[model samples]
Target: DNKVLHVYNWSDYIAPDTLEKFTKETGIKVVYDVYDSNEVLEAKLLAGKSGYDVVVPSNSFLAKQIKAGVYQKLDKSKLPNWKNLNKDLMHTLEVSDPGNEHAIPYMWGTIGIGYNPDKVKAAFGDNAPVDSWDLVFKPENIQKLKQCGVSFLDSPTEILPAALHYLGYKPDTDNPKELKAAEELFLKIRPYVTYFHSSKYISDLANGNICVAIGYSGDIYQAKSRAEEAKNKVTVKYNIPKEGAGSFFDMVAIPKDAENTEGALAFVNFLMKPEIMAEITDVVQFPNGNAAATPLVSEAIRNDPGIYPSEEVMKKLYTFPDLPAKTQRAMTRSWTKIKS
Candidate 1:
């Protein structure tokens, strides 16, 4: 019997030991590659030289890839644990199915404001809108905190949408006029940003270098735990913002020419098992899309508003759509100008 060659996902996103365990149990050889961004993953797939058996792309990117005809439909019969998925997540996952195929929901989260309550109270007073989006857009607030540290996500998709929200425009709007308004708003806020980052926002906030930052809900949750362990006066609070934030699903997908589709599906099926799902939550510290796994999560995690979020907050979240190629290019060009 030939060993299954597995291409595991990115760093800090999934536990390495889990992959090791999967290999030990199934006698499969795992080849792991890590990508920091969805664009990099898409680039690799488009380049068409690498032989990746399995890849995890964010749901929006998965939708885009499907549109590009780069993915294959997953045979549900091979995955018995599919029924364990949360109903709401199942619906969201279906959005990526361009041909009613390709991609399995791996992880899910929303983009939101992460703030240190103590630092925020000291800087802007306790009565400030801790859960509101105003902190990033209000000119008066930005002026007052001109020297005070604030961070934005380095990713254009993440940061640009915030500017759209600030302008009271849809984040995924294709209208050229709306995009111009968003760009203008981003330019106004750019000078106030102390740093445009992704990985280090939590560290800067915990160290008192940055008072607030926009971040992924999961990353902030993990950061809060680290802060607690360090005994820092850091409280990571997530706010959905009045003008809606972006919701994204991270999913596992098989390439059209994958060499080890069977083994990949088997591993993904194992991962969907309730027990395995629980362990994933324990390690990643993010909520799982498996309903069977939710009960097994730590009570503290279950109650954490930043991780689980409330119904009202969840309602305000939006997902990115598969934009037309021309529109995507326009948005990319505008983003490049903003960054330049």
Candidate 2:
């Protein structure tokens, strides 16, 4: 049957061949679009009938969306490949989806620092705290890098928590005093930031346009790979800042008013297969949620501590909270002020 399935996901998130392979195998055309922020995806879903059959939203936003009934209950009968997902990850996601009713885990990654070695070393010499938040959060250090370029994510939910963590506060603190302190921290370094964007840093880093960016782990890796292939003589490196960073689980769910639920289910089922999921992880440089797919991912990426973070590294990662409505509004207001 000829049909179309609309999917919305993060940019550079899949293997190049995945969509083409799916269309060939299932005879369902794919209309894919991408977003760089959870806020953008969440706002679209909250506004009503987004027309996309499948959309990927991280767990914290998914938890809020579930409360608002933004997604339909998944029909497991159509997703036999569901058995391949990692149980521990599934159990963690249960906190958001509760018994895993609305979504299936796609990939998980952390928000951290990506930078250019030549540029950072030139600014701070061999001992640069590239592995620490000090490199970006400290006004003196960031100002030095600013001469080359420096960027932070436009995502308040992600960056504010890192700021809080750097300041010795809980990453999810809702306290006004702590939030105000974070705002002050950003204001101190704002002028040096080349831009606050979620995805642009990927290319900027790959092309050596930006020396440092606070961005997602996998997105930075994709930039690293692109730099390698482009032979631009630029090198991109990612690290989980010693002060810790936020980890996220992106899940695929069907919109409540989707037109092609059957086709969506077929597409989701296709993506869950171990081989297919492995290929995606290999390209995107993120760990798939499929347990069986882990072994299939290329060993270089599979063993890279930056991708599948070691136990010690995992201890430092935190997940964002589903903030109370009042705090959410306050945070958004603060984020707007910070940007302005």
Question: In candidate 2, where is summed lDDT lowest over 10 consecutive residues?
Answer: 308-317
Give the 10-residue window scoring lowest on summed lDDT in candidate 1: 91-100
TM-score of model 2 vs. true structure: 0.72
Write one digit per residue (lDDT tens) for candidate 1, span 116-138: 77777777765767677888787
Q: lDDT at 72 for candidate 1?
A: 71
Could you report the Cα RMSD, in angstroms, for every candidate shown?
Answer: 3.7, 4.8
C-alpha lDDT values of all predictions: 0.74, 0.86
Give the C-alpha miss distance for residue 45 in model 2, angstroms: 7.9
For model 1, what is the C-alpha lDDT against the true structure? 0.74
TM-scores for all candidates: the values are: 0.80, 0.72
Residue-pair clashes per prediction, in order, are: 0, 0
